[PDB]
Structures are given as structure tokens and as C-alpha cells.
Amino acid sequence: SKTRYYLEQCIPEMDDLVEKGLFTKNEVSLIMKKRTDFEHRLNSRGSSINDYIKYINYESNVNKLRAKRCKRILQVKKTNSLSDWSIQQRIGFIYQRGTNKFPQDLKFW
């Protein structure tokens, strides 16, 4: 299935969060559970563009939470590791999938 391939792409990110201590393992699991439902929704039949917008919004919110726990816990503006740029790259990847699937919707473009 396509879904599992996309989920495993997240693992190196979730590993970095625990190692940096920003998120606990239980918290990290909850993020993956929400992604698992999203990443599945996109690849299954009946998907609409709104599913892409929801997932993009969710990933954007996770980026904010990481950015604040960085200064709160690590006390560093940018942690030099994979976690810094994974989300921003992922959100871009979601857009490229969305526009290919639904080139009609001008709002998404």
C-alpha cells in the first residue's frame, strides 16, 4: 500500500523529536496516529481537496508546537538536526500531491 511508505518517511522525524527531548514517546505516538488517518484518507478513494487542506493545517500546527518547545526546553532558536526542516518539506510534498490530483481547484493552487 502507498500509505505505509509515506508513514515510514515520518519515522526519522519522530526519532529526532524524542532524542532532542522535545516530545515524549506517548505524545509522539499521538501525532503519528493522527497522521496515519490523514495519510490514509488522501490515498483512498473518495478523497476531496479539503482532506489536503486539513492535513496541511494540522502539519502547520505541529510545526508551531515544535518551534515553541524548542525555546521552552532546548532554549535554542534552531536545533541543527532533521526535525528543523522535515515539516516544511512535508507540507510542500502534500501540496504537490494535491495539485496533481485536483488541478481544477484554483483555491488550492
Nearer to another protein, 79 or 99 (CB): 99
CA distance to 18, 44, 69, 80, 102, per residue, from 28 (Å): 8, 24, 13, 20, 31
**Could you say which residues in the range 67-106 bind another protein, by CB under 8 A?**
100-104
Least distance from C-beta 104 to another protein, angstroms?
4
Which triple of cell numbers denotes residue 19? 532524542
Amino acid occupying residue 16: D
Task: Give 73's DSSP letter.
Answer: I
- Asked whether position 26 contacts another protein by CB under 8 A, the answer is no
Separation between Cα atoms, residue 52 and residue 40, nearest integer Å: 11
1 binds another protein (CB under 8 A): no
Contact between 44 and another protein by CB under 8 A: the answer reads: no
In the complex, least distance from residue 103 CB atom to another protein, rounded to whole angstroms: 5
Residues contributing to the site for another protein (CB under 8 A): 100-104
